[PDB]
Amino acid sequence: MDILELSERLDLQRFHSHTLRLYRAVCALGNNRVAHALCSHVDQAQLLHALEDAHLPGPLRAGYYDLLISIHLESACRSRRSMLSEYIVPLTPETRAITLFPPGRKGGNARRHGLPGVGVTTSLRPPHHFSPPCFVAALPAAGVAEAPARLSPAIPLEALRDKALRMLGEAVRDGGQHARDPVGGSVEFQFVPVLKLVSTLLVMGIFGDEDVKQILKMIEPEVFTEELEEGLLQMKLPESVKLQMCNLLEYFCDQELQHRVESLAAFAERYVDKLQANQRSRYALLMRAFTMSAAETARRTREFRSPPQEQINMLLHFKDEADEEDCPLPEDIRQDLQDFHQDLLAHCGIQLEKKPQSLQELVSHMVVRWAQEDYVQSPELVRAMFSLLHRQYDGLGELLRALPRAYTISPSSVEDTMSLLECLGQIRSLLIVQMGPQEENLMIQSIGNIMNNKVFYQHPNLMRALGMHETVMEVMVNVLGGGETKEIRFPKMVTSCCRFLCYFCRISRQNQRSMFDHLSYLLENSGIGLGMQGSTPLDVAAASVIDNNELALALQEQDLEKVVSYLAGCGLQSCPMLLAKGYPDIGWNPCGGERYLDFLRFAVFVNGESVEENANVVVRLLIRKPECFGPALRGEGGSGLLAAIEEAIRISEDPARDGPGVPPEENRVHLGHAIMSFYAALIDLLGRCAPEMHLIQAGKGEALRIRAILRSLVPLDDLVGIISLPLQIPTLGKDGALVQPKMSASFVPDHKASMVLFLDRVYGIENQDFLLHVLDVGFLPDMRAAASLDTATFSTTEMALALNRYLCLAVLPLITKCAP
């Protein structure tokens, strides 16, 4: 039948409208592949015919318009809108030319505003990418989750914009005539789809200067004539049409803001050039004339010695006219800035006929007139109109809030910046959709490309302005949250999520601070990520706190308590994943305990010195929850540390106790090594928490407390025994086959190193008898073993390397200190 019979066949109209809704849903939010598939069922010719068809029911008309937008324009519009909020200005002659006001004789204040959306924009927005629809092409042999992401189907955008403008003008004239047969059966059905398409095309950037002028004249000719027709504003339209008009005006106001930002950047380029030249000349003159007067030269050179930011501040500190004299700058340089400031205030309307003559006045009058004329029943329209009114009444504030998102780059970084922007757009798109194999691969690829990009390292401030770390963060946590109890999927994604963030913290201290701000958010998600091997949110937190005394002192008691609670849970409960894998069931989780313990280490001990503020807190919390120490050191019915280590070695020897023993990864956990490493990390943390000596000499009672408590917790005899414990040594046997101990399943020197750190920091070596005792029992044997393994066959053995690291790190410095 003719689709036009659906005007009377209502059930069919409903079913087809909901079919179009389903078409939009399946292609919604980035499914460009589904969009391509749909292009077969609903073709470009069908869609374009429906756009013009005046006899379609409004539901079908709107559905087809929205389907076109969804298939072709939705992804690009969303990607571009995500970027519009950010302003990255390349320093280019085009940028330099930009001015707030177009050239003219009329005075700065009076100067008639240029038409919004008509001008030169240098802000960086990545291009749109489309792929032609074809269904005879060869099928890619690459499997799912390996094939590259598909682009949106292409449609002729210039013809589409021309058609849209023409149809909008036709709608305007028809509304002026006030006919009784509106397209679609109502003014809403007539106008709303066209306005939606026009707004999409504007945001996408398809419209040119002349097209923008035509749109402006359709809106209100009188105001927007540069140098009868009735405009949509006076066409006395319903609320939905008003909402669409509000969105259009929001676009135009955003463009005005963008113009302001770009003009400010251009003036910054020129004024910085002038200031740089003047500063050079003044420094030269000073280096010429310092000989006459040596006293004032000091105050003069304060400028050239101060940080550049402070130099700029001082140079600009002449607004109030009370402190202008101190500023070295001349009156011409000062007056250029003053003039630009006045011009900006005029552009924003601050500086002091019935007809608006300006977009701000037009928008304010429109909103007030609408509200006066009727009580709006659309909360969305209310929100939009009052937002526009606020923007018009506060132009300076909007610019002030946009400035943080503004960054100037050299023209030689544009290509890398654009690639980074494309990757960031991909990542941002990945937020809305649920994570899958494909999305994980794309995310990993984007992270890798960003890391390869130099700009990432060169411009961390730009990264923070772009909000990249928060986006990565949100993706990771969203992925974790889903079914976190069952299993933590996409561990590769999470590992990438550090490599990005857990390096981003190292790039800059400000980046480290930014990530520190989210510490609590990371910790609550960190609990489940214990099993998942690799870089974790706990590592994110450790990177946020590592080597920054400022951040460590900022660290919070509540976060420490959360960590200690997780550690107590580990100390009292076994790991369900290991139980499922069939490991022998012990009562506690040494691996997670060790993770938390090393985090607390990074928190308390910084740059070689302990932070007593955090250390005392950790000690108090741990002693309040003694389960964190482990089943050993429990007190009543508790074995000693040495006994625990011996039992761990026994387990390591005996299979069916170290593991199920019934591994492609080769990273399978060995329980003996896990226990020994847990205890070693605990002892290391306690030793680091141990007070620095100068406090002890000072006599600080708190320090004496902490030291006595640590001594009570860990007896010295046990440390000496652990240090004395033998270590398996590589040997050649059975035809000279090299027999080498596995480290992941055996006692290792770093375990002894932790004990040595504890001994040095808490107990100390002050008496020759104890010195000789320790050296004869534990140290000298190990040094002899290292020397014996210093042979061609054995010298490169990982065991020998670990022994040498242990020696150089712990023993040799200690003997050097105790030499007297």
């Binding site: 598939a37 269904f135 060869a138």
Partner: protein, 107 residues
Amino acid sequence: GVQVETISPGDGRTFPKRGQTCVVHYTGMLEDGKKFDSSRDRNKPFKFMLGKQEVIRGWEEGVAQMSVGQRAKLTISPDYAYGATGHPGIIPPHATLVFDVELLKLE
């Protein structure tokens, strides 16, 4: 399964050569008669180079047997077509494909 029928004759003497781009208009129909693709709807001729495996075998062989200015119907078995995997959404598995191809010019 490439089977070519002549709807309208061409020159009969000039035929596509490897490395020579073929420009066509086409309408794609499944054997049951349902249309799934048409270049004329987009109003843009489809260009493809022979021997680069860009298009399915069905096309590779049919256009080669065809001549400039020729209009033909090509019936392609699934094996020469997308096959058991099919084209998700567009083409079902194990589908014979019927095409109406007009070979505009060679470049």
